[PDB]
């Protein structure tokens, strides 16, 4: 139903997303500087102007699934930014990305990042998902989602039970923030469909 071109997709977060999309009948297409099964791979070259805007010609959906082994924090804000003006060159009006759990409102104001506790090694990329994120807000012209991981995705159960909402952190009742990458993948995809969070974060965790 829809055709949704895709940055990331061999991650682990990335793989998974391109294969539940496939699986419901969208057509996918794995876009990549150096570009692979029931899904289509294509190259281009996400902070070349011309590169991206001619790969995304005719796509319904452009999303982003670098994860925390391929994201680097210095390139988060800029993969934003290209998409933005990729999304806006080719007439593609849909764009989802990978968000930071660090960026989870965990009271009005308040994100996970500066609480107490948050783990060192991972604030670096959770400040530069806040700015990317803080960018996204000033763009009013695309239908754009910012779908932050909980604080722990790993490959897990494909279970289709989970939480959802705009942003917020969501724990269960022992303070676990916690998604399988198969269920995250859900909830993308999911998204992808129904925009429920239209220039909105997003998140999911059990």
Same mark, same amino acid.
């Given at each position: ?37 029931? &899904?289509? %791979?294509? +190259?281009?070259? *996400?902070? #070349?102007? $011309?590169?991206? =805007? ?6 319904? !959906? ?13 390139? &988060?804000? %800029?993969? +934003?930014?290209? *998409?933005? #003006?990729? $999304?806006?060159? =080719? ?6 990305? !990978? ?13 996970? &990042? ?9 604030? $670096? ?82």
């Amino acid at each position: 139903m829809l055709k949704i071109a895709l940055f990331g997709a061999t991650g682990m977060i990335g793989s998974r997303i391109a294969a539940e999309a496939a699986r419901r009948g969208h057509q996918v297409t794995a876009l990549s500087r150096n570009p692979g099964a029931n &899904v289509q %791979a294509k +190259a281009a070259d *996400l902070f #070349d102007p $011309a590169s991206i =805007a001619a790969a995304l010609a005719g796509q319904d !959906v452009v999303a982003s699934a670098y994860g925390p082994k391929q994201e680097e924090a210095s390139k &988060v804000v %800029a993969v +934003a930014k290209a *998409l933005v #003006d990729g $999304a806006r060159k =080719a007439g593609v009006k849909r764009v989802v990305v !990978v968000g930071g759990a660090g960026t989870l409102e965990v009271a009005p104001g308040k994100q996970l &990042v500066d609480t107490e506790g948050f783990p060192d090694a991972y604030k $670096a990329v959770a400040l530069a998902h806040r700015d990317a994120y803080g960018y996204l807000s000033t763009v009013q012209d695309l239908d754009w989602t910012f779908f932050s991981p909980a604080a722990l995705i790993a490959p897990g159960e494909r279970t289709g039970r989970f939480r959802t909402g705009a942003g917020r952190l969501i724990v269960d009742e022992q303070g676990n923030s916690k998604i399988s990458a198969e269920d995250y993948a859900i909830a993308f995809v999911d998204e992808i469909e129904q925009g429920r969070f239209i220039r909105q974060a997003a998140t999911a965790a059990y």
